[PDB]
Amino acid sequence: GSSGSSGVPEKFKLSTALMDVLGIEVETRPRIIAAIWHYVKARKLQNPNDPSFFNCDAALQKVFGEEKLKFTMVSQKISHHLSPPPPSGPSSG
């Protein structure tokens, strides 16, 4: 066992651009992916041709850089942006 969901959940610090996309600071893995799912649709970014893909608004680019992306790929895209937030207390390992 190395990675999973033991005890408290997992939160990742949003990027400057990613933060300007949704407007958060410390969220989870899904909350974000979803936050993008909603936002996208919210901004009528959703793509008709492909229900899996979605158009970019302008802030989604700086994040990915592609005109459009998949609703699932975001996971394997936002991750890179995802970072470890500031923990509370001493640490070693």
From Swiss-Prot:
It is found in: Nucleus. Disulfide bonds: none annotated. Residues 8-84 form the SWIB/MDM2 domain. Belongs to the SMARCD family. Involved in transcriptional activation and repression of select genes by chromatin remodeling (alteration of DNA-nucleosome topology). Part of a SWI-SNF complex. This is SWI/SNF complex component SNF12 homolog. It comes from Arabidopsis thaliana. The chain holds residues 315 to 394 of 534 of the full protein.
